[PDB]
Design an enzyme around this catalytic site. Sequence first.
Site, PDB file in Angstrom:
ATOM      1  N   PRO A 137      57.360  54.031  44.915  1.00 50.25           N
ATOM      2  CA  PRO A 137      57.023  55.113  43.961  1.00 50.25           C
ATOM      3  C   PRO A 137      57.475  54.861  42.537  1.00 50.25           C
ATOM      4  O   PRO A 137      56.808  55.304  41.598  1.00 50.25           O
ATOM      5  CB  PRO A 137      57.708  56.345  44.583  1.00 50.25           C
ATOM      6  CG  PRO A 137      57.868  56.015  46.000  1.00 50.25           C
ATOM      7  CD  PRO A 137      58.108  54.548  46.088  1.00 50.25           C
ATOM      8  N   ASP A 176      54.260  35.156  39.466  1.00 47.32           N
ATOM      9  CA  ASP A 176      52.961  34.757  39.972  1.00 47.32           C
ATOM     10  C   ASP A 176      52.977  33.289  40.389  1.00 47.32           C
ATOM     11  O   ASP A 176      54.015  32.793  40.842  1.00 47.32           O
ATOM     12  CB  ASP A 176      51.861  35.137  38.926  1.00 47.32           C
ATOM     13  CG  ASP A 176      50.525  35.402  39.519  1.00 47.32           C
ATOM     14  OD1 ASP A 176      49.848  34.457  39.973  1.00 47.32           O
ATOM     15  OD2 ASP A 176      50.102  36.582  39.460  1.00 47.32           O
ATOM     16  N   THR A 193      37.143  55.555  24.288  1.00 47.10           N
ATOM     17  CA  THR A 193      36.996  56.625  25.267  1.00 47.10           C
ATOM     18  C   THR A 193      35.810  56.409  26.196  1.00 47.10           C
ATOM     19  O   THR A 193      35.782  57.037  27.275  1.00 47.10           O
ATOM     20  CB  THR A 193      36.870  57.997  24.590  1.00 47.10           C
ATOM     21  OG1 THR A 193      35.720  58.006  23.755  1.00 47.10           O
ATOM     22  CG2 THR A 193      38.081  58.337  23.775  1.00 47.10           C
ATOM     23  N   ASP A 197      49.220  55.011  40.077  1.00 49.80           N
ATOM     24  CA  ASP A 197      49.553  55.703  38.855  1.00 49.80           C
ATOM     25  C   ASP A 197      48.462  55.652  37.808  1.00 49.80           C
ATOM     26  O   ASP A 197      48.437  56.534  36.927  1.00 49.80           O
ATOM     27  CB  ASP A 197      50.822  55.131  38.228  1.00 49.80           C
ATOM     28  CG  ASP A 197      52.015  55.280  39.146  1.00 49.80           C
ATOM     29  OD1 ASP A 197      52.509  56.419  39.250  1.00 49.80           O
ATOM     30  OD2 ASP A 197      52.455  54.294  39.750  1.00 49.80           O
ATOM     31  N   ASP A 238      36.982  59.721  33.930  1.00 46.25           N
ATOM     32  CA  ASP A 238      35.867  58.857  33.578  1.00 46.25           C
ATOM     33  C   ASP A 238      35.357  58.002  34.717  1.00 46.25           C
ATOM     34  O   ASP A 238      34.238  57.474  34.608  1.00 46.25           O
ATOM     35  CB  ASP A 238      36.344  57.871  32.509  1.00 46.25           C
ATOM     36  CG  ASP A 238      36.460  58.499  31.158  1.00 46.25           C
ATOM     37  OD1 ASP A 238      36.040  59.662  31.028  1.00 46.25           O
ATOM     38  OD2 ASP A 238      36.898  57.817  30.204  1.00 46.25           O
ATOM     39  N   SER A 284      44.710  42.246  40.705  1.00 42.65           N
ATOM     40  CA  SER A 284      45.549  41.314  39.967  1.00 42.65           C
ATOM     41  C   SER A 284      45.190  41.225  38.497  1.00 42.65           C
ATOM     42  O   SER A 284      46.031  40.855  37.696  1.00 42.65           O
ATOM     43  CB  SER A 284      45.417  39.911  40.551  1.00 42.65           C
ATOM     44  OG  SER A 284      45.964  39.801  41.843  1.00 42.65           O
ATOM     45  N   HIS A 322      45.748  31.434  38.960  1.00 41.07           N
ATOM     46  CA  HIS A 322      45.894  32.883  39.017  1.00 41.07           C
ATOM     47  C   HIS A 322      46.924  33.365  38.014  1.00 41.07           C
ATOM     48  O   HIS A 322      46.669  34.292  37.247  1.00 41.07           O
ATOM     49  CB  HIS A 322      46.260  33.229  40.446  1.00 41.07           C
ATOM     50  CG  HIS A 322      46.321  34.702  40.742  1.00 41.07           C
ATOM     51  ND1 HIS A 322      47.485  35.445  40.652  1.00 41.07           N
ATOM     52  CD2 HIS A 322      45.355  35.564  41.157  1.00 41.07           C
ATOM     53  CE1 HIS A 322      47.237  36.688  41.012  1.00 41.07           C
ATOM     54  NE2 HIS A 322      45.961  36.788  41.336  1.00 41.07           N
ATOM     55  N   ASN A 365      43.690  44.757  47.098  1.00 39.57           N
ATOM     56  CA  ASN A 365      42.239  44.565  47.120  1.00 39.57           C
ATOM     57  C   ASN A 365      41.653  44.801  48.503  1.00 39.57           C
ATOM     58  O   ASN A 365      40.705  44.134  48.916  1.00 39.57           O
ATOM     59  CB  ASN A 365      41.850  43.160  46.658  1.00 39.57           C
ATOM     60  CG  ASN A 365      42.448  42.800  45.315  1.00 39.57           C
ATOM     61  OD1 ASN A 365      42.540  43.593  44.405  1.00 39.57           O
ATOM     62  ND2 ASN A 365      42.851  41.546  45.196  1.00 39.57           N
ATOM     63  N   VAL A 374      57.724  52.280  40.519  1.00 43.14           N
ATOM     64  CA  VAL A 374      57.072  51.317  39.650  1.00 43.14           C
ATOM     65  C   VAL A 374      55.669  51.814  39.314  1.00 43.14           C
ATOM     66  O   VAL A 374      55.237  52.878  39.789  1.00 43.14           O
ATOM     67  CB  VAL A 374      57.011  49.901  40.267  1.00 43.14           C
ATOM     68  CG1 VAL A 374      58.413  49.391  40.520  1.00 43.14           C
ATOM     69  CG2 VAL A 374      56.156  49.838  41.560  1.00 43.14           C
TER      70      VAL A 374
END
Length: 277
Positions: free
Chosen positions: A175, A39, A16, A200, A260, A224, A69, A161, A177
């Site tokens: 929306p 990728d 937490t 999300d 948080d 990523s 990557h 990014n 995904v």
Amino acid sequence: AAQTNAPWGLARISSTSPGTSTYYYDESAGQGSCVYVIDTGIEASHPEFEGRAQMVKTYYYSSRDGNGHGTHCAGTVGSRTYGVAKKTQLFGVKVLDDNGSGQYSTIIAGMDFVASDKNNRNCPKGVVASLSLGGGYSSSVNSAAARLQSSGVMVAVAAGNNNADARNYSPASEPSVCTVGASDRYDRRSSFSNYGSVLDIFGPGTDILSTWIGGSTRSISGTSMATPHVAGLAAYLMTLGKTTAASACRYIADTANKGDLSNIPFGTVNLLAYNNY
């Protein structure tokens, strides 16, 4: 199970509070699930994959990850030391070239490939796709990601990014995904992370240690790097029977650490992926 001296992002997923270094997780570890890493490829020979990784498709002359990557992202999903779901099966789909770029037509074809290929595979606990990629808004790219989700795959995608609203990027803006922003080890929004109502969830994305090509490891930063934390968490929770491909994003948001993160703009969720172990 407990991994001591874990990468901070793995520790973060099971606490937490920020600042811990042990990753606590159920021993099932995503066994019986499968995650497609769409990728630059995966160095499937890397010892950290323990034979659980394989390339299944490329859109270039070679299937080799000449960049790193994709190997890094796959390691955050599923490597022994750097992965969320340490027993998942990893499938590599090379839609990005060795410079990390790809045409939208290729990225679309790769998603449609996964939607079909999963029917060749044994994934009794379900199927996830991790898309640490994106570019400008494209309805056709968004629709491809929606189809992949509709076909029964838990699709997780990077928010981007650009330190901007993700509504202008794809597949981030789709929306249906799971669109993933990035945080840092002090629970700040990562300085580069996109934001906006379409996000999300957040996952760890600044200074993430994982696998790299040449049998190596390295730390890099981006949405990523956040995305495969969420993809691996979904695979882990699906293996536990706690959620389904169709509902895993919502379940992750339902069960996330709430409130948080700092420097979250008004209108963006303040939710950080959490396994509640």
